[PDB]
Amino acid sequence: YRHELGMNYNFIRPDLIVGSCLQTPEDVDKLRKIGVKTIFCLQQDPDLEYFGVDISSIQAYAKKYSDIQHIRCEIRDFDAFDLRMRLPAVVGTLYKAVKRNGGVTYVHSTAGMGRAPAVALTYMFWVQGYKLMEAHKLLMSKRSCFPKLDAIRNATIDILTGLKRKTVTLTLKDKGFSRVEISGLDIGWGQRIPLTLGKGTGFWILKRELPEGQFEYKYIIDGEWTHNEAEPFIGPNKDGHTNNYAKVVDDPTSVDGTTRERLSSEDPELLEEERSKLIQFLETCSEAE
Amino acid sequence: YRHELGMNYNFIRPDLIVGSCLQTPEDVDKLRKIGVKTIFCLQQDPDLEYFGVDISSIQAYAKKYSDIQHIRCEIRDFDAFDLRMRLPAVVGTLYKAVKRNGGVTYVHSTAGMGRAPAVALTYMFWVQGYKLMEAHKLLMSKRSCFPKLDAIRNATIDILTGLKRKTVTLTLKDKGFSRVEISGLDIGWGQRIPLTLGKGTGFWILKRELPEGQFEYKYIIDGEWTHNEAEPFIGPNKDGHTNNYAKVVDDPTSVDGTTRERLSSEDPELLEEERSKLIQFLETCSEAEV
């Protein structure tokens, strides 16, 4: 991501843009000039600090014009789980913003290559009425980005079937270690949580409550990134990493489990009843401001 | 690119890896474990110094092991034109090493999302007899990256029919400006060249010698990035930028044959005779392994 090259963006539709972060109050004017009426910011505070972006100044400047509304809907960077968890409420807020403001919608994260593309893809999928893979093919033809299709599929299933959590136990045999923690899982790759050394077993142990799906994680052993060979692992993935994974299954025979299987396909064929339920959920979501 | 997560890589073929930079001497052992016999490093010293990587220690540790060799053959980061210029010599240097060393080859840059995939792709295309787009499809199914297909296509034409530069003139009407520069073209987006104001015309002018291709550029006017609307522009591009572009097409020639239509296409159709000559020429372009 080339910050110094300035704010970059892509028209996906005449009413929808996916782009990088606003850097100065002047960027608000550039967007007003192209008919943007909604600035949908997905950035967290630490993301703005790293590049020295004064968000409050940008917000205050956007407040001066009723023409254009600035909205913050935080999603954690570098965290596929938070994406999944946040998509329902985030798109809800986006859905109410577009209905209220119209014009052109500017959806942005920091780089506009992860969070922003995923949110816009989800919106096109649930609200605009596109098939997932067809909207994906459109987005990719316009902008070099890496949206998490798995996260979008899972958020869709989470709305329709609900969230079913089970206890997941992660273990690592101690070989004279002092400090052991994992990253990824449901806390993201920019974060770590410590495991505890079992007094009886001599294994480092971690317990997490996780919904259905597959979650990649890696160990940090005395400040050394590594995967446990005694636990299931996958890769090298498309980011080039070999990670451990935990898989969570409830019951595929169940009616909620059947819909999960159908909607876990690459291009999920969504029922008319299911599409109506998605909209019903978005109407539940709270308007910004 | 996330450097904190350590070295990342992907097998493209059983004997070809595209990865990110080695960070510690320990990473040589990592690669020795999976049968790597050539570490092919495309990074420049400013790439390494930015991430605090001690390349000398990595080279020294690799020199200790006879089964693995470390080669430095640099290409500028974030420079699509330099990439185009460097490919013949780089792929030629790569080719000689692999033929001698065998085993698994590790092609890497800083992130392994720009230079490294482009070089591996070019290597598969020029040397291993892949069609460009077939090799590309394989690469993309393994690793997320942005190779510059345009740079590879143009380098192929450069070798096969020659690098011929022509004068392009870029102009910008003055409206009380004091400083006018251009970024992009053949210098990259991290560099800029100053234009000169014509006293008679009231236009800022740039004369540039450029080979065949399409060259995106932008003006920087009193510090501000902007495209000239009185000149041809396209975008937003795949990176989210709206740029002017200059287009250079070679003069027609009596010995063009069918070369022009075959090579300019999305998936360049190479004659067997051309592939055979191309590989041979690549060797003559190779650089000292140092």
SS3 labels along A220-234: EECCCEECCCCCCEE
Distance from CA of B208 to the nearest CA of A (A): 23
Residues whose CB is less than 8 angstroms from the CB of residue B198 and which lie 6 or more positions away in sequence, other chains included: B204, B205
**DSSP states along A116-149:** HHHHHHHHIIIII---HHHHHHHHHHH------H
Q: Residue A259, class by beta-carbon neighbours within 10 Å (0-12 exposed, 13-18 middle, 19+ buried)? A: middle
Resolution in A: 2.4
Q: Which residues are paired to A244 by β-bridges? A: A217, A233
CATH of the domain at B237: 2.60.40.10
A-B interface: how many C-beta pairs under 8 angstroms?
54
Identity at B169, one-letter amino acid code: T
Residues whose CB is less than 8 angstroms from the CB of residue A206 and which lie 6 or more positions away in sequence, other chains included: A169, A170, A171, A182, A193, A195, A196
Residues in chain A: 289
Contact A229, A219 (CB under 8 A): no
Residues whose CB is less than 8 angstroms from the CB of residue A267 and which lie 6 or more positions away in sequence, other chains included: A131, A132, A133, A134
- The total domain count for chain B is 2
- Chain B residue whose CA is closest to A78: B2
For residues B236 and A10, give the distance between their C-alpha atoms in angstroms, rounded to a whole number: 6
Residues whose CB is less than 8 angstroms from the CB of residue A66 and which lie 6 or more positions away in sequence, other chains included: none
For residues B235 and B233, give the distance between their C-alpha atoms in angstroms, rounded to a whole number: 7
For residues A88 and A279, give the distance between their C-alpha atoms in angstroms, rounded to a whole number: 11
Residues whose CB is less than 8 angstroms from the CB of residue B255 and which lie 6 or more positions away in sequence, other chains included: none
Asked if B10 lies within 8 A of A241 by C-beta distance, the reply is no
| Locus of tokens 């119209």 | A102
Contact A130, A16 (CB under 8 A): no
Chain B residues touching chain A at CB-CB below 8 Å: 2, 5-6, 8-11, 19-20, 78, 112, 142-144, 146, 189, 225, 236, 238-241
Contact B113, B1 (CB under 8 A): yes
Residues in chain B: 290
Q: Contacts from B247-251 at CB under 8 Å and sequence distance 24+? A: B247/B213, B247/B214, B247/B215, B248/B166, B248/B168, B248/B210, B248/B211, B248/B212, B248/B213, B248/B215, B249/B212, B250/B161, B250/B164, B250/B212, B251/B164
Contact B222, B177 (CB under 8 A): yes
Residues whose CB is less than 8 angstroms from the CB of residue B29 and which lie 6 or more positions away in sequence, other chains included: none
Are B25 and B157 found together in one domain? yes
Q: Are strands A16-19 and A104-108 parallel, antiparallel or unpaired?
A: parallel
Token couple for B91: 């792929």
DSSP structural state of residue B41: E
Are B63 and B134 found together in one domain? yes
For residues B47 and B108, give the distance between their C-alpha atoms in angstroms, rounded to a whole number: 12
Are B199 and B287 found together in one domain? no
Residues of A in contact with B26 (CB under 8 A): none
Instruction: Find the helix packing angle between B80-101 and B115-126, rounded to 10°.
Output: 60
For residues B13 and B56, give the distance between their C-alpha atoms in angstroms, rounded to a whole number: 29
Asked if A240 lies within 8 A of B6 by C-beta distance, the reply is no
For residues B105 and B6, give the distance between their C-alpha atoms in angstroms, rounded to a whole number: 19
Q: Is the dihedral of CA A187, A189, A193, A198 positive or negative?
A: positive
DSSP structural state of residue A286: P
Q: Contacts from B128-131 at CB under 8 Å and sequence distance 24+? A: B129/B275, B131/B267
First CA to last CA across chain A, in angstroms?
A: 30
Asked if B236 lies within 8 A of A6 by C-beta distance, the reply is no
CA angle, B250 then B254 then B258, to 5°: 75
Q: Which of B164, B145, B160, B38 is nearest to B96 (CA)?
A: B38
Residues whose CB is less than 8 angstroms from the CB of residue A174 and which lie 6 or more positions away in sequence, other chains included: A180, A197, A202, A203, A204
Q: Contacts from B247-255 at CB under 8 Å and sequence distance 24+? A: B247/B213, B247/B214, B247/B215, B248/B166, B248/B168, B248/B210, B248/B211, B248/B212, B248/B213, B248/B215, B249/B212, B250/B161, B250/B164, B250/B212, B251/B164
Name the structure determination technique. Answer: X-ray
Asked if A240 lies within 8 A of B78 by C-beta distance, the reply is no
Phi, psi of B83 (to 5 degrees): -55, -50
Are A84 and A219 found together in one domain? no
Phi/psi-derived region of residue A235, left when phi > 0, alpha when psi is between -120 and 50, beta in every other case: left
Asked if B240 lies within 8 A of A189 by C-beta distance, the reply is no
Task: Select from B78, B144, B225 the Cβ nearest to the Cβ of A238.
Answer: B144
Asked if A5 lies within 8 A of B144 by C-beta distance, the reply is no
Q: Are strands A166-173 and A203-210 parallel, antiparallel or unpaired?
A: antiparallel
**DSSP states along A159-222:** HHH----EEEEEEEE-SS-S-EEEEETTTEEEEEEE-EE-TTT-EEEEEEEE-SEEEEEEEEES
- Provide the 10 A C-beta neighbour count for residue B237: 16
Q: Which of A233, A96, A216, A107 is nearest to A151 (CA)?
A: A216
- Chain A residue whose CA is closest to B146: A144
Residues of A in contact with B239 (CB under 8 A): 2, 8, 143-144
Is the bond preceding B117 in cis, omega lying within 30 degrees of 0?
no
CA angle, A14 then B218 then A5, to 5°: 75
Helix (H, G, I), strand (E, B) or coil at B197: strand
Are A100 and A201 found together in one domain? no
Token couple for B209: 């010698």
Q: Which of B61, B67, B66, B72 is nearest to B21 (CA)?
A: B72
Chain A residues touching chain B at CB-CB below 8 Å: 2, 5-6, 8-11, 19-20, 78, 112, 142-144, 146, 189, 218, 225, 236, 238-241
Are A45 and A123 found together in one domain? yes
Are A149 and A222 found together in one domain? no
Asked if B8 lies within 8 A of A142 by C-beta distance, the reply is no
Separate counts of helices (H) and strands (E) for chain B: 9, 14
- Provide the 10 A C-beta neighbour count for residue A37: 21
Q: Which residues are paired to A51 by β-bridges? A: none
Which candidate in B33, B241, B242, B243 is best for mutational testing of the A interface (most A CBs within 10 A)? B241
Residues whose CB is less than 8 angstroms from the CB of residue A207 and which lie 6 or more positions away in sequence, other chains included: A167, A168, A169, A170
- Provide the 10 A C-beta neighbour count for residue A93: 18
Distance from CA of B160 to the nearest CA of A (A): 30
CATH of the domain at B133: 3.90.190.10
Distance from CA of A256 to the nearest CA of B (A): 32
For residues A166 and A116, give the distance between their C-alpha atoms in angstroms, rounded to a whole number: 30
Q: Which of A289, A213, A288 is nearest to A246 (CA)?
A: A213
Are B126 and B266 found together in one domain? yes
Task: Select from B2, B6, B239 the Cβ nearest to the Cβ of A8.
Answer: B239
Asked if B238 lies within 8 A of A20 by C-beta distance, the reply is no
Residues of B in contact with A6 (CB under 8 A): 225
Q: Name the helix (H) or strand (E) containing A275.
A: helix A272-284
Token couple for B270: 């190479």
Are A94 and A232 found together in one domain? no
Token couple for A16: 């929808």
Q: Residue B176, class by beta-carbon neighbours within 10 Å (0-12 exposed, 13-18 middle, 19+ buried)? A: exposed
Identity at A249, one-letter amino acid code: V
**DSSP states along B210-266:** E-SEEEEEEEEETTEEE--TTS-EE-S-TTS--EEEEEE-PPP-TT-TTHHHHHSSS
Q: Residue A115, class by beta-carbon neighbours within 10 Å (0-12 exposed, 13-18 middle, 19+ buried)? A: buried
**Residue B26 CA: distances (Å) to CA of A219, A224, B101:** 18, 12, 21
Helices (H), B51-195: 55-63, 80-101, 115-126, 132-142, 149-161
Contact A57, A28 (CB under 8 A): no
Asked if B11 lies within 8 A of A241 by C-beta distance, the reply is no
- Chain B residue whose CA is closest to A144: B238
Are B198 and B219 found together in one domain? yes
**DSSP states along A54-106:** -HHHHHHHHHT-TTSEEEE----TT-HHHHHHHHHHHHHHHHHHHHHH-SEEE
A260-281 burial: b if 16+ Cβ within 10 Å, else e: beebeeeebebeeebeeebeeb
What radius of gyration do chain B's Cα atoms show?
A: 21
Are A141 and A243 found together in one domain? no
Residues of A in contact with B5 (CB under 8 A): 189, 218, 225, 241
Are A38 and A181 found together in one domain? no
Domain boundaries, position A172:
163-253
- Chain B residue whose CA is closest to A219: B5
Which candidate in B8, B145, B225 is best for mutational testing of the A interface (most A CBs within 10 A)? B8
